[model samples]
Target: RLRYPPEMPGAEVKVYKKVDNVDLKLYIYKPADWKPADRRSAIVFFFGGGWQSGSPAQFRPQCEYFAGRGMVAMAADYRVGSRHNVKVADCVADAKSAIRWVRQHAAELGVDPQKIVASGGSAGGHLAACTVMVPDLEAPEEDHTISSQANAAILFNPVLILSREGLRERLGTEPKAVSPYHHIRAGLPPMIIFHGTADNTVPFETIRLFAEAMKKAGNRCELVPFEGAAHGFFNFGRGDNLAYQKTLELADEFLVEIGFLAPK
Candidate 1:
């Protein structure tokens, strides 16, 4: 019985999918005076917790902030080890399902299907990256006609490479299938990753190599490094909030550059 944070103003909870007889939901934050025909840009965020434990409430502030900036912001709930006891593939499948559900129902959600952004932190960030990098892993019951790919991504210390020591066991025999770095290819959506240079959990070198591989593959990937910062530095209410503010400012600029947000 984990208590989620208070709902944000104008936030609405909607069930996007039902898996294992569980109703997985997404919390949407819409701008005031929104309409079905608006066709505004949108972003969906997933929380970080090593794929074991986390809540959509973790991104409540981000959803509220982005909604205020004129985008339909959403925090999605997916299967995780702590709650659903699912595998990494199950997590990736749920991530893909969330994107497809958003795109398939764009008209009803008042969002532009071509302007959706997938974002998350840590393991959730890995799932976000998977939406674009991995081509497979859709749930059996999902609509294959609807696209599961996002137009862009904003990752916070995402686990791009999963073949590292202590992590290889999670992928079973198909590590490359879920490794964003290993699956880098042309035509990937533009992505901006926020990582700390001193991050020990996911390792800064992994991100550095991932960025390099993205460039080699001719994709638009930008890595913003926070000097002397560690894992979870961008989390709100952590480390004096310096890294959090910096990441937010840079993320806003990046979103504007990608046409997902208006320039202010």
Candidate 2:
């Protein structure tokens, strides 16, 4: 019942319970006259707060912007360190469950399953990347209840690889369960990344190296640099901000290029 653009009459909001039993809230925004035949796409957004703080509310502005532009937008709250002190597996599980739930309810939400995209920033970006890379971790021999795959990824300054070159050194005393880059597979969803060359938290070099690996593996990946900007530069065009608006432009372009949107 949290309304962003109160005067805009077509937005819908709903809360879903993730398979992990976490209360996952989702916001669905669309044009009032939107119909099934239109076959619009959706973008599922995850917020970043070092995996400890942040909420679906953090991405409200971006979601509302996209929704206002005619796409079904969903922002979800996944289990984070603050909520559960969840390890990497738990985080990934919540992510997968959220995606599965979204796909299952796509029809009711008017989402084109094939066109669904996952997006997030910083640590949330890492979750988005991992979700796309390791889709369906719960095999048929295992839990057959959820589909853990995402169709595509739009990651902003995401932690690309979990190798020593990525976040391994930062794990400190935490077990390997905290790193996401160590697990990599071929055929990941097409990805578009936004990063600031000056980023210190996630490191821009990490993004570059990961993109190179993806390309070498024949995956479609692209990076949009923010010049001299730093971490979290894509948070709504603030502080040396070329990344904010440019990222949105690139994301919209990617969606249209991939058949999710009709050409303007």
Candidate 3:
């Protein structure tokens, strides 16, 4: 029942946290055959709109699609500067908290904690990367024993570097600690980054650089570039679903290779 450019038909809302006097919710799309004891692979999505504001509904299509593919999919919300009056680091913590909450409730949600995929667009993509790349800053209330890192990541037009002029203060976090590019190392999850080569919002070269560094670190990283396309082109329904279908097709192949999904 999302009324906007992106539309989704059915979703089940669940509160993952009630923190700072605010309720944080996730819009989940589960397969019809899903059962509480079934440990299906899950994908968690964070929406775009920088670190200030956005809606989880932005990723409802993706959630619905993954559910159709027999996975537990959900779009999560987090503390944003515009809403929670917090810093970018706090956003990272909230993302971690959401992941931990899902992991803690995996049995009830019919999700496999070890097969979770973190996926997002733009700044939300940065948050997805942070769940695996950023080393610390998880919410103090959550159990540290539970990992917030995703098994793999799918990023669409993500902001990978934050050390540029005015980027640090605008994001309200230290670049060295949060920049996925700077934090690249071994032991990270496999990743697929789909970016528009002509994207004006975030430079395409940044993803190229990150992909190179990831390979150098002996990790799995795939950078799929769409020539002449602009930022957000990979979103569902863009160009009558041209870009969206292409990205999803490639993404499916990646998931199959990584054992998250079956070959179509």
Candidate 4:
């Protein structure tokens, strides 16, 4: 139940309420001259801090960057594992709910309802994957306002897909919830995954296995490996780091492939 501005003076930031008790905030940033009827494409970001200590603010740069690129940029804050002592299910629900909410209000937010893309890093990336891949888990009756579908996604060092290693085995209750990997599907959106070879938090193998599955399912997905880089490589982009530069380049290319970015 996080309250956000419906439309900023120069931008539009809307909050879409969800069924879960978690407080979800969706921030929409548009160009100053943008109009609601223009129907531009959008990119929704889920910030990651181990699904614990992250806020929409952590992704401000990304939002602004996308907005500057003549696209609608959005960020959302959902209940994290550290916030409610919840399991992956709770986080997955929140992620799904946020994407659904965005599609529901695409007209108001001035975004192309059919071109919405989901993205995030680490656990946030995992949540983004859950939102775009698990399309069967939509609840239309509860909100009856918006559609629950993500057209594409960009993942950075996403977690718990290949293997559920080091994750909490004992939950607040017994029979720990299933990981996101257990829920892959055949209708996933076009996806781009970024992972560092040396990332210890979420192994490189995680991305590899997921990419394999996505291909097998006839889904469009690409994996970008950052050699010798570690987890959160994009956070600091390593002073003149090739990994960081490549990330930006790949992102731009991805947007173009999905028809969001125009050739310059």
Local accuracy of candidate 2 as per-residue lDDT tens digits, 1-264? 233223222446666554455455666667556776556677878778776667666566778777767788877777666666565555666666667767777777677777778888887788787677754433123344545567888887877555453333333224434344554557667889989898888778877877877788888888888788788888864754455677878888887787776555
- Tell me how candidate 3 scores on lDDT: 0.85
Q: Model 1, range 54-124, lDDT digits (tens) per residue? A: 88877888888888888999999998887776888888888998999999999999999999999999999
Q: What is the alpha-carbon lDDT of model 1 when measured against the actual structure?
A: 0.87
> Could you give candidate 4's per-residue lDDT for residues 156-235 as a string of tens digits?
78874533454454222222133556656686678898898999888788778878877898888898888877898875
**Residue pairs that clash (backbone atoms under 3 angstroms), model 4:** 1-23, 104-146
User: Sort by lDDT, best first: what order?
Assistant: 1, 3, 4, 2
The number of the candidate with the highest TM-score is: 1
In model 3, which regions exceed 4 Å deviation?
1-9, 164-167
Show where candidate 1 strays beyond 4 Å: 1-9, 164-169
Candidate 3 lDDT over residue span 23-99, tens digit each: 88777899978899999888989888888877787788778778888889999887777767878788888888888
At residue 158, candidate 2 shows an lDDT of 79
Q: Which one is best on lDDT?
A: 1
**Cα lDDT, all candidates:** 0.87, 0.69, 0.85, 0.71
In terms of lDDT, which candidate is stronger, 2 or 4?
Answer: 4
